[PDB]
Amino acid sequence: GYEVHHQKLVFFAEDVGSNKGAIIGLMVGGVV
Amino acid sequence: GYEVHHQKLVFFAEDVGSNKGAIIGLMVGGVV
Amino acid sequence: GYEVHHQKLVFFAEDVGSNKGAIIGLMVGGVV
Amino acid sequence: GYEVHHQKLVFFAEDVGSNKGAIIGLMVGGVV
Amino acid sequence: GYEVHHQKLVFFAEDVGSNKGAIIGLMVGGVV
Amino acid sequence: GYEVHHQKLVFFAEDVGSNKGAIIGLMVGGVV
Amino acid sequence: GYEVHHQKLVFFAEDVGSNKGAIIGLMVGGVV
Amino acid sequence: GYEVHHQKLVFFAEDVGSNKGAIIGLMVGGVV
Amino acid sequence: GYEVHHQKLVFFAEDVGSNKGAIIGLMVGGVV
Amino acid sequence: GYEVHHQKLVFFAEDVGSNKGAIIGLMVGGVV
Amino acid sequence: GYEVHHQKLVFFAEDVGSNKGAIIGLMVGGVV
Amino acid sequence: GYEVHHQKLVFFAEDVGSNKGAIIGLMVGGVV
Amino acid sequence: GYEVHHQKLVFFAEDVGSNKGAIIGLMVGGVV
Amino acid sequence: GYEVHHQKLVFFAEDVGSNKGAIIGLMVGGVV
Amino acid sequence: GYEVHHQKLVFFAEDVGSNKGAIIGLMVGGVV
Amino acid sequence: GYEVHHQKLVFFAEDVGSNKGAIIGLMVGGVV
Amino acid sequence: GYEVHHQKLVFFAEDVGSNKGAIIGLMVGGVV
Amino acid sequence: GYEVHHQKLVFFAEDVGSNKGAIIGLMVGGVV
């Protein structure tokens, strides 16, 4: 029938006073 | 009776005096 | 109030004040 | 009548950070 | 008939030249 | 009805030319 | 007329009365 | 006289003898 | 003497009424 | 100084209709 | 100095306007 | 003199000109 | 005596160390 | 004193070879 | 106050007639 | 002292036509 | 007040066509 | 007082201009 495809990726980063901050190792998704 | 698809990932990092914070090792499947 | 299969992840790192904060290891096998 | 196959994951690091160094290990087999 | 295929990708970084302090290794999507 | 299929990519970085600063190893999408 | 080392991948797909929720995740190390 | 050894995968999606449509996740240790 | 190795990939997809809606995620290797 | 080595890749899809979950994610090789 | 090394790539498929809807992410080879 | 090594690609598809149809992210090779 | 926190892995493989079962499979939670 | 945090890996392999079956598998995830 | 961090990889491998017969499959990290 | 981070990759190897030699598969930590 | 980060890649070896299976597959970098 | 960073790759081997030699699939650098 009818299908709509979209995605939202917001990458916002400052850059001083920078400690290690954070680490993300992740698997999320693959199909539908 | 409507078929739609979306994704939503918000990656925000501030270079505060915010230290490691956390380490995320995750495998979460969202496929079917 | 109709929705379809989509991803939803909020990854945010800011003004951490405590310590390491958290170490997380989690896995799923076989998405419904 | 229609099912929405997705998961809600909010991962954030701020003032609050649980304990000095908390570790979480979890394994699941068979999402239903 | 209505069919659309797009994606919202937004990346903002301030004060470059020095390490941000954040690392994301992640897999999201693939098929829809 | 109008049908279109293209990506929307927007980004801005201050003090560019050096290194990325943070590192995002991310896979977003693949098949419509 | 001499045997040699080679890979063998036979992926055949015919759905049948094989519905939506068929997922298999499996890892086998030759010797380990 | 060289040994000729390789792995072989036969994945057939058909009326196999598993479940009507199950979800499985697992691993096997080759040798110990 | 003589050494000849070749790959063998046979990927075949049909299209009856029940659609190709299954997930194969496997890792075969490691050793031997 | 004579050697023979080629790959055999056979990708086949007819009267396609792949939807809901057609995904093969495989790590094949590593050793021999 | 003569050598015989070529690849054999065979692709057979339908190419209508709607995408088939299937993805093969496979690492075949590595070692031999 | 000159070695004998070249690629050999043969592809046959119906209604070409449009989109790929499916996506094969396949790494074939590694070592002979 | 100076205390420096860094990674250090020396993998030396020789006809030694291997005994009563040269196959190792181990995992460590979060903090050593 | 000052702490020196750096990466360091020395992979050294001689080539004897008859051995029980030298296979090593190790996983870490979080902090040391 | 001041710290020094750098990579250092020494990959050394011999070539006698008998291969050592060693495989390293590891996940090293766990920030430190 | 001053913060310094330089690269150092030394690959020393003998690649004759004897046995496999060695297989290293490793994820070397993101931070420190 | 200042930092130093230069590249340094050195490869010393026998550049013949390839051992049966000398393979280094590693992820080094990410952060510091 | 000034930041210094540039490329430096040195490939040395005994044989000829130099083929691949061994198989290094290594990710180096990326981010300090």
Q: Is there a contact between G7 and J24 if contact means CB atoms under 8 Å apart?
A: no
Report yes or no: O16 and M14 within 8 Å, Cβ to Cβ.
Answer: no
Chains that touch M (3 or more CB pairs under 8 A): C, D, G, H, N, O, P
For C31, the closest chain H residue by CA position comes to H23
Tokens of H32: 């110990």
How many CB atoms lie under 10 A from the CB of residue B9? 24
**Domain ranges within chain L, ordered by starting residue:** 1-32
What is the spatial distance between Cα C25 and Cα C9, in angstroms, rounded to a whole number?
16
Which residues of chain F lie closer than 8 angstroms to Q30, CB-CB?
Answer: 23, 25
Pairs of CB atoms within 8 A across B/J: 4
Contact E23 R32 (CB under 8 A): no
Kindly state whether C25 is in contact with chain M, defined as any CB-CB distance less than 8 angstroms. yes
Q: What is the DSSP letter of R4?
A: B
The minimum CA-CA distance between L15 and chain Q, rounded to whole Å, is: 40
Distance separating alpha carbons of residues L6 and I3, to the nearest angstrom:
19
- Is R5 marked within a binding site? yes
Residue B11 pairs in a beta bridge with A11, C11
d(CA O18, CA P6): 37
Token pair for residue A18? 């920078």
Q: J1: buried, middle or exposed (CB in 10 Å: 19+, 13-18, 0-12)?
A: exposed
With CA atoms as reference, the chain Q residue closest to L31 would be Q21
Q: Does O22 touch chain M (CB under 8 A)?
A: yes
- Candidates O26, N29, Q13, F28; CA nearest to R16 is Q13
* Block residue for tokens 């190790």: N26
I14: which residues sit within 8 A by CB, 6+ positions away? G13, G14, G15, J14, J15
For residues J25 and K26, give the distance between their C-alpha atoms in angstroms, rounded to a whole number: 6
Q: How many CB atoms lie within 10 A of CB R2?
A: 7
Q: Is residue K21 annotated as involved in ligand binding?
A: no
Q: Which of J27, G24, I9, J28 is nearest to H16 (CA)?
A: G24
Look up residue J21 and give its DSSP letter: T
Q: Tell me if N9 sits within 8 A of P9, measured CB to CB.
A: no
Class of domain Q1-32 (CATH, top level): few secondary structures
Written as six digits, the tokens of C3 are 């929705």
Experiment used for this model: NMR
**Bridge partners, residue R13, by sequence:** Q13
**What's the CA gap between O15 and M14, in Å, rounded?**
13
A30 touches chain J (CB under 8 A): yes
Q: From the CA of D18, how many Å to the nearest CA of chain B?
A: 10
| J29 has binding-site annotation | no
For M13, the enclosing helix (H) or strand (E) is strand M9-13
> Cα Q2 vs. chain centroid, distance in angstroms?
26
Instruction: Tell me phi and psi for residue A31, to 5 degrees.
Output: -155, 135
For D26, other C-beta atoms within 10 Å of its C-beta total: 10
- The rounded distance, in Å, linking the Cα atoms of L24 and K24 is 5
Task: Select from R31, P23, N11, F21 the least CA-distant residue to M11.
Answer: N11
Q: What is d(CA J15, CA I14) in angstroms, rounded to the nearest whole number?
A: 7
**H/E element, F16:** none
